[PDB]
Design a protein around this ligand. Structure first.
Ligand SMILES: CN(Cc1cnc2nc(N)nc(N)c2n1)c1ccc(C(=O)N[C@@H](CCC(=O)O)C(=O)O)cc1
Ligand SMILES: CN(Cc1cnc2nc(N)nc(N)c2n1)c1ccc(C(=O)N[C@@H](CCC(=O)O)C(=O)O)cc1
Ligand SMILES: Cc1ncc(COP(=O)(O)O)c(CN[C@@H](CO)C(=O)O)c1O
Ligand SMILES: Cc1ncc(COP(=O)(O)O)c(CN[C@@H](CO)C(=O)O)c1O
Ligand SMILES: Cc1ncc(COP(=O)(O)O)c(CN[C@@H](CO)C(=O)O)c1O
Lengths: 475, 475, 475, 480
C-alpha cells in the first residue's frame, strides 16, 4: 500500500478522478462558447494557474518574510517579498510611503480585516448603499435583519446615489457624515458605472477625522494600467481583490500609507499608524497560514500588469464598454447615470416593462452570463429591475468594439424573447413565467436559435488558459 | 495588441515569469531534500493541484448550488454538490443528520464564521489555552492585548492542562464552565498529543446548554480513515482545515447537525438550528465568491480519503509517531504528556537547558523544518521552551518506523550542536547565539555535516506531486 | 450609654447640628429674597416635604406592592399603590391602556432604565442635540469624548433645530431617521421654548418601527393641568421628573402603554410589551430598595396636581411667560424661536454684544438666579451666548403678569451693568471682567442698588414651604 | 376676583400641613409609625433614622438645581448648597479618618445600586470583566447576577460578570478558588462586599489578588459602614482602591450613597515614572455628567447630619452594642440548638441554618411575619435550589437603635425559638408536603392561630416598652 499510495499521489487528475476531470472539461467548453458579461469575472493566465496549482500549497508560513513561526520558509519568503515588491510597482507606489499585505484570502475578509485593525467593535462606518451599487463587505442591513456581518460587529450607515443623475450624492454624504460621525468611509463600488470623486471623499474624511478606505476591487486593473485616476492619490488604505479586472488569482491585497504623515497631520505621533495594525489584524488576528500558492500566482499576475500589452488590454476594456453603452442606448435601453466611465454598465429595464429576473433567465438559456441587479427606484430588493454587464472577460479573449456591438444586439434579442414569454404567460408570477419558458415550443425554438448565434460568435475567439486542440468537448 | 496579450495569457510560467518558476523549483528541491516535520504540513497529490490550478478559478458563484446570484454556474454547481457529497461520505455521515459547508476559505475564518452564526457579539467561548496547545482562532489575549480577533468580538476564557500529566484537566474545565457559563466550548487543538475525551466535553456542553464545536483540523485525516475515534459521535458542529492530515488543498469545511434533535415535553419535534445560521454566516455574512478551484480540488482529496491506501497511510502516521516519541524519550527528551496518541509530539527542552528558539535555528540550518513552540511551564510566550514535530508529511513520502527513529537521532544531533553554540556564546542574548552560530567555523562545519546527513536520508524517498527527473535543481 | 444615643436620635436639627441648621436658614432667606428664574426649579409644598422627611425612609421594600422580597410592607404598599393610581389620574390616563413605575430615583436614571428595558447595548437612539436644547440623559458626545454614558452604552445621533426659525427641523429628523434606523426616538427638551410636534414624531416612529419616548420633565405640570397638549396621546413611553413644573419631590416616573396595541394580518391581537421589561429594568435591573419617603411625598404632589387651583397655577405660568417674553422683545432682546409657548424663554444675547457668562455673573450678584445657556450658532459650549429663564418658581409665590414685566425690567438693568463692566474691563478675558466687577466701586454700587431693588420686590411675596415669621434671617 | 382667589388658593395649598392637605397619606404614615413601634425588626439592612436627619431631608434644600460640583456649578444661586455639599464631603472623609490628600469622595450618588454602576462606568469599558460574591452566597444584585435563564442585574448586561463562592464546608469565602478563578477570567475589577455574610472580609487577600491581576479593588461596605466609622471592625480603606456604601443601613443616615476613591501616587513604575491614581475625575464625571443630573441636596444635607453623628462617642457606643448584641444573640441561638453558618459571627448579623431543625426558611419566615418578627429567608450551604432556602438571616442594628441590649436579644432569640416551634407544629399538622399546604394549615388551624396570636402579643408588648426613634409616642395617632 506504501508504493501504491505514492502512485495515487503522483497520478494525473484524468486517471485519479475522471468525474472531476469531466466537470472541468465541461466548464472549459462553457467559457469557450459563452458571452461572459459578469463585470467581476475575467480569464486568468495559464502562468498564474500553474503557480496556484504548484507545491507552494504545501507550506505553513505564519508571520511575515524573515519573521516566521515555522522553519523551511527560505523560498516562500522569496515569493512573498517578490509579490509585495511587484504589488507596489504595479500601482507606481513609493515603498517609503506605501506598504502592502498580500495574505488576505479574498476581498470580503480583506475589508473586515481593515475594520478590525483600525476600528473598535461597534465603531461607525459609512459606505455606498448595497441597492445603489455598494458591496456587502461594506455593511448592509434591512428593516429586520443584519445581512452582512460587518453590520453586526460595526455600526454602518449607507450613503446614496442622486436618483435623478445616477451619480453619488456627495452633498448628502457630507451632511450625513456630520451627524453620524463615521470613523471610516469606504470609497468603492460593485455596480457603479462612473469614476469616484476621491478628492471629495478625502475632504469629508479630513473634516470627520475618518479613515479613507478605497475599495478598488472592480477597477484595480484599470488603475494599475493608468487608464483611470488612481485612488492612491487620496486614500489612507486601499483594498482590492486580485481576480477581477486585475486578472490574477482569487485573492486580495491591502495597501496602506506608512512613514511620515503630512506636515499638517503630524502630532503626538509623526508616523502613520496603519501598517502594524493591519498586518496584525491579518495575522495573528483573523487568519492563520498564508496561501502561498495563491501569493505566488499573484506575483505572476502583478508582473503581467506592468506590460504594454496589459495597458493596451485595459484601454480596450474602456473603449469596448463605451461602445457597448452607446449601442445599448441606441437600441432604447436606459442606463443608470446614462452611460459609463469604466468597465461596466447597469441597464435599467423599467422603460421596457420587464424585470431583471425574467431577462436573466433568458440570458442564461442563450449562454449569456450576466446578473440581475437592483437599480435606483426599485421598490424591493427581492425584485431587481436591472441587468449588470461589463467588458473585462470578453475583452481578454480579444473582443473589440464591433464585437460588443454584436453582444448588445444579442442581449436585445434575448430581452425581446423575455417580453414574449411574459406576454404568453397566464399569471403575473415568476413561476408562471418559468412555466411558459419551459413549455412553449415556439419560444424554446427562438431561445435555441439565439443560443446557437451566441455560441457561434464566441467560439471564433481564442480560449484563455488552455488550448482548443486538447479540449474534450469540441462541439 | 490583441494577439500580443493573448499569447501572454496562454504562455507557460517558465516563459512568462522565470523568476517565479525558479522559486517554485527551489521549493520543489527543498521538499525533496529536507525533513518536513511541521505536523500541520502535508504533501498533497498532483490531481488536487491540477484541479486547484484549473479554470474553475474564473467563476463567480455567490450563493449555494441551485441558488446562485449569477448565471453560468451549471458546472460549478456540479463541483460544489459533488464536494459536499464526498465530504459527508469521507466521515461516514448520514446526510439526514449532518450537513456541510465547503466554502470557508481556511481554518481560522471557518471558526469565526461558526461563532458569528451561533453567538451574538461578546458572548462566551471556552477553549484550550494557546500556551497549552490551543489555536489562535479559539481566542487568546494577554493582560494588555487581545491577540486573536476572536477575543475582540467574543468573550473568551481558556481551559488548561493538568501541568503534572500534560492531559486536559477535564474536572477543572467542568468547574470553570459552571462559573463562566460558556455558550460554546471548543474541543480541538494544534499541539495536543493525546485524544480528546469528546464524551466528557459533551456532558459539560449538555449541562451548560453550550454548543459543542470540535475543531478537528489536525486529526481530520486520521478521523476520515477511522484510525482514531470520531468527534462526529458527540459534537454539534465540526470544523476542519483540508490541508493537514486530510492531505487536500488549503481550505476548510464546516459540518453541523441537522434535522430532528429531540421531542419536547408537549410532544412537538425540536429541530437543530445550525444549518441556515452557519450557511448564512459564510455567505452573505462574511465571504463573497466561493473559490471554486479550491472546492474542486477538495472534492478530489475527499475521494482519495476513501481508499484502503489512504487508511494504510493514516495507520502508518500513527505508528511512525509512536516510534518517534519512543526514540526521543530514549534519547533523554521530555514530551508534553509523556508521549503521543496521534500524529505529533511536543518536546519540552527544559531538562536540556536550552530554549526552542535556539534549537529551531539549528534545525533550520540542517534542513529540518519544525517550529519553536510554547510548553507548559514557560514563563514567557516570547521565549518558547519547546519544539513541535510530527509525522504526516514524511509519512506521505514513505517514511516508516525505523526512518522516524533516524529522524529522532538527527534531531538529537542538532540539539547537541545548539548546546555547543550556546556554550561558545560569550553573551546570553539570542543575537549572541546567532552571532556565534554564523561565525564559529568548527560549529558551521558540524552543521554542514548534519545537513548533508539529513539531505542524503530524505532524498532517497519519493517526491510527492512532481517527478524527480524534471527537477531543475537536482544538486 | 443606651440613653446616650437615644437622645441623639430624637433631638432636633437645631440641637444636633447648628451648622447645618444655619445653612438651611441661609437658603430659606435666599429663596425669599431672590428672583428664582431657573425654569427647572420650583418651590414644593410643606406637605410634600413633611412626607419626604418621614419615617417612611426606614423600610426596605425591594420589589413591588404585593410582591415584595420582605415582610412588613403593608403600609409601604398602601403608599406606593396610592402613588401609582394618583399618577395615572394626574394625567387622565386609562389604567387599562397605561401603567406607571414610581420608583425611579430621578430623571436621568429613569431614561437610562427605559433604554435598558427596551434596547440591547449599542442599539440606536435619536434625540434633540444638547446644544439645541436637549438633555444629557438622551445622549451626547463631542468630537473627542462621550459625555453622557447613554452614548457609551447606546449608539446615539442628534436631531437639530432649523437655525433660521429656532423650531425643531422635523423634515431633517425624518430624513436622518431613514438612514440611521433608530430603535427609539426621544421627544423631550430642557431648553426648548415651543411645543413638540408629537404627531410628527409618532409618524416617524411608525415608519421606523421605533419606540416613541416622550421626556416631559420640564412640562409635566402643564400637561397634568391640561393647559398644553399631552404627549400621552402619541407616545409609547413617557418619562418625567417630579420636581420641576409638576412641583413635587425630587424623583421620577415612567409611564408605558399596556394592553392591546393592534390587530395583526392573521386577525390576532398584538399586545404591548413594555410593562414587564420596564419594571424589571428598574428593579432588579438597576435599582435596589425604593425610596419610600420620596414615593409618599410624590403621592401628595400628585393629589395636588388634580385640583382646580393647581390648574389655575399652571395657566398663570403660561401667561406669565408670555408676558415675560413680550417685555423682553419690547426691550430689544432676541429670543430663540422668537417667543415662547411654554414656561421658559431662551435669550440670545449676541445682538447686545455680550455673552451669557458675563451676564449671569451680574445676575448672581443682584440675586437673580438663572443659567447661562448655549444658543444655536454657538461654536463652543464653553462660551454660551444666552440666558435661560422661566416662570414656574416665582409663579408659585404669586408673581403675575405685571410682576414678570418687572422681572424683565430688572434683567435688562442687569444686562446694562454687565455691558458697563465689559466696557470698563482692562482686557477681553472673563478673568478681566471678574476683576473689574469686583474692584470697580461705581459698578459695585450699581449692582448693590439693583440687588436691593430685586430683594425689596421679592420679599413682598409669600414664602413657600416655611413661615416668614420664624425665619432666622429676616433682615 | 377669581384670578386672585385661585392664587390665594394655590399658595394656601403649598403652605398647609400634610395632616390638612392629605389626611389619607398622613394616616398611612401614622400606621407605619405604629408598625415600627411594635415589631422586632431583625432585617440587618434596616435601621431607624434620627429626627435631625429627617428634618434636613424634609427641608427646602430640595428646591435647588446644582449640577456640577461645589464652586463649579452650571446654575446660579448655589452659595449655600455649596456649603452643604462641601461640609458633607469634609465630614465624609472625617467619619472614616481619611487623609484628604489620599482620598476623595463623591456624595451625589442617589443610592447604593447606581453608585456601584457609576464606578463600573467610570473605570471599565462596556463588557469588561467584574468578579463579585455570588448573590446566593451573600452578594448583592448591583455586583451583577445571572441565572441559567437570564441576566437579572443590568450590571451583567453592560459588563461581563463572574461570581466567586463560599467554601460550603466552612461558610467563609473561598479565597483560594477566587484567586484561581481570577487567573483564568482576568477581571478588571473585583468587588469585596457582602449583604448576607456573618464574617468580615480578608481585604489583605483581596488586595493581593487585585495586585496580581492588575484589577481595581472595590470594597462595597454598605452593610458595615457604621461599624467601620466607629472603628469597631477593620476598615476596607486600609486596602481598597475605591469604596462604595449606602448612607442608610449600618451608617444610619438618609437613603443615599457615597463613593470614596484613592488620590495621589499609586507606584513608581519600572521606568521611574510616577503612576498616579486615575479615579477621581473618572468617577466624578461618571456621576455627573455621565449618569445623573441634579444632586438631591436635601439628601446631601441630611447625610452631612448623619456623618456628624457618626463621629460621636454615643455613636461608637451604639456600634459597640450592635456587635455585643449580635454575639449574645448568637450565644443564645447556639444554646438553644441552632446551627449558625460559619459557626458564629463577627458582625451585625447571623445566618441560621435550619436544617437540623427539620424545617426550611420559607416556613419559618411566614410564622415570624405573623408574630411581627421581621427576618428574611436565606440560602445556606447545602441547599439544592436558590429558590427554596434553608436558613434565616437576622441582625441587630435596628433594635439596638431603640435601646435593646444583650439581655433583650437573649429574649429575641427566645421568641424566635418559640416561633420555630410553632412552625414545626404547623408542618406536623399540615395535610400534605408542599408549601401551600403549610400556608393552608397556618391560616386554618384555630389552635395554632391562637398560639401565634399569643406570641405576637408577647413580641409587641416587649417592643412597645422601648423608645420610638424619630418621633414622640405622645403624639402618635395609634397608641394601641
Ligand atoms: C460637560 N459637558 C456637558 C454640558 C455642557 N454645557 C452645559 N450647560 C448647562 N447650562 N448645563 C449642563 N448640564 C451642561 N452640560 C460638555 C463638555 C464639553 C463640551 C465641548 O466642549 N464640545 C465641543 C468641543 C469638545 C471636543 O471636540 O473635544 C464640541 O465638539 O462640540 C460640551 C459639553
Ligand atoms: C432577582 N433574584 C433575587 C431574589 C428574587 N426573589 C426574592 N424573593 C424573596 N422573597 N426574597 C429575595 N431576597 C429574593 N431575591 C433572583 C432571580 C432569579 C433567581 C433564579 O432563578 N435562581 C435559579 C437558580 C440559580 C441559577 O439558575 O443559576 C432557580 O433555581 O430559581 C434567583 C434570584
Ligand atoms: C467592491 C468589492 N469589494 C469586495 C468584493 C469581495 O470580493 P470576494 O468575492 O473575493 O470576497 C467585491 C466582489 N464583488 C462581486 C460580488 O461579491 C461582484 O460581482 O461585483 C467587490 O465588488
Ligand atoms: C486546530 C486548528 N484550527 C484551525 C487552524 C487554522 O487553519 P488556517 O491556518 O488555514 O487558518 C489551525 C492551524 N494551525 C496551524 C497554525 O495556525 C498549525 O501549524 O498547527 C489549527 O491547528
Ligand atoms: C428633559 C429632562 N429630562 C431629564 C432631566 C434629568 O432630571 P434629573 O436632574 O433629576 O436627573 C432633565 C433635567 N434637566 C435639568 C438639567 O439636568 C434642567 O435644568 O433643565 C430634563 O430637563
Amino acid at each position: 500500500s506504501r508504493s501504491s499510495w505514492i502512485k495515487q499521489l503522483n497520478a494525473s487528475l484524468d486517471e485519479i478522478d475522471p468525474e472531476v476531470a469531466d466537470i472541468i472539461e465541461l466548464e472549459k467548453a462553457r467559457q469557450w462558447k459563452g458571452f461572459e458579461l459578469i463585470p467581476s469575472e475575467n480569464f486568468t493566465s495559464l502562468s498564474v494557474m500553474q503557480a496556484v496549482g504548484s507545491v507552494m500549497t504545501n507550506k505553513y508560513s505564519e508571520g511575515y518574510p524573515g519573521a516566521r513561526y515555522y522553519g523551511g520558509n527560505e523560498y516562500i519568503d522569496m515569493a512573498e517579498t517578490l509579490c509585495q515588491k511587484r504589488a507596489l510597482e504595479a500601482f507606481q507606489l513609493d515603498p517609503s510611503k506605501w506598504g502592502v499585505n498580500v495574505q488576505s484570502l479574498s476581498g470580503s475578509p480583506a475589508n473586515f480585516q481593515v475594520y478590525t485593525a483600525l476600528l473598535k467593535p461597534h465603531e461607525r462606518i459609512m459606505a455606498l448603499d448595497l441597492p445603489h451599487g455598494g458591496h456587502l463587505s461594506h455593511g448592509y442591513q434591512t428593516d429586520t435583519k443584519k445581512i452582512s456581518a460587518v453590520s453586526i460587529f460595526f455600526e454602518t450607515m449607507p450613503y446614496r446615489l442622486d436618483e435623478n443623475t445616477g451619480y453619488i450624492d456627495y452633498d448628502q454624504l457630507e451632511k450625513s457624515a456630520v451627524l453620524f460621525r463615521p470613523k471610516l468611509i469606504v470609497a468603492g463600488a460593485s455596480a457603479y458605472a462612473r469614476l469616484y470623486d476621491y478628492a471629495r471623499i478625502r475632504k469629508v474624511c479630513n473634516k470627520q477625522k475618518a479613515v479613507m478606505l478605497a475599495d478598488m476591487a472592480h477597477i484595480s486593473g484599470l488603475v494599475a494600467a493608468g487608464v483611470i485616476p488612481s485612488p492612491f492619490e487620496y486614500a489612507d488604505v486601499v483594498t482590492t481583490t486580485t481576480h477581477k479586472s486585475l486578472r490574477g488569482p482569487r485573492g486580495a491585497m491591502i495597501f496602506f500609507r506608512k512613514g511620515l504623515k503630512e506636515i499638517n497631520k503630524q502630532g503626538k505621533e509623526v508616523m502613520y499608524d496603519y501598517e502594524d495594525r493591519i498586518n496584525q489584524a491579518v495575522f495573528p488576528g483573523l487568519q492563520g497560514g498564508p496561501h502561498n500558492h495563491t501569493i505566488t500566482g499573484l506575483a505572476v499576475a502583478l508582473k503581467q500588469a506592468r506590460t504594454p500589452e496589459y495597458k493596451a488590454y485595459q484601454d480596450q476594456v474602456l473603449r469596448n464598454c463605451s461602445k457597448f453603452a452607446e449601442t445599448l442606448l441606441a437600441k432604447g435601453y436606459d442606463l443608470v447615470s446614462g452611460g459609463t466611465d469604466n468597465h461596466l454598465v447597469l441597464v435599467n429595464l423599467k422603460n421596457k416593462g420587464i424585470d431583471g429576473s425574467r431577462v436573466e433567465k433568458v440570458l442564461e438559456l442563450v449562454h449569456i452570463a450576466a446578473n440581475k441587479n437592483t437599480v435606483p427606484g426599485d421598490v424591493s430588493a427581492m425584485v431587481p429591475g436591472g441587468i449588470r454587464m461589463g467588458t473585462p472577460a470578453l475583452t481578454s479573449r480579444g473582443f473589440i468594439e464591433e464585437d460588443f456591438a454584436k453582444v448588445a444586439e444579442y442581449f436585445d434579442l434575448a430581452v425581446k424573447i423575455a417580453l414574449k414569454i411574459k406576454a404568453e404567460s397566464q399569471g403575473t408570477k415568476l413561476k408562471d413565467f418559468v412555466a411558459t419558458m419551459q413549455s412553449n415550443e415556439k419560444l424554446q425554438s427562438e431561445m435555441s436559435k439565439l443560443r446557437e448565434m451566441v455560441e457561434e460568435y464566441a467560439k471564433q475567439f481564442p480560449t484563455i488558459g488552455f488550448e482548443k486542440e486538447t479540449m474534450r468537448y469540441k462541439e
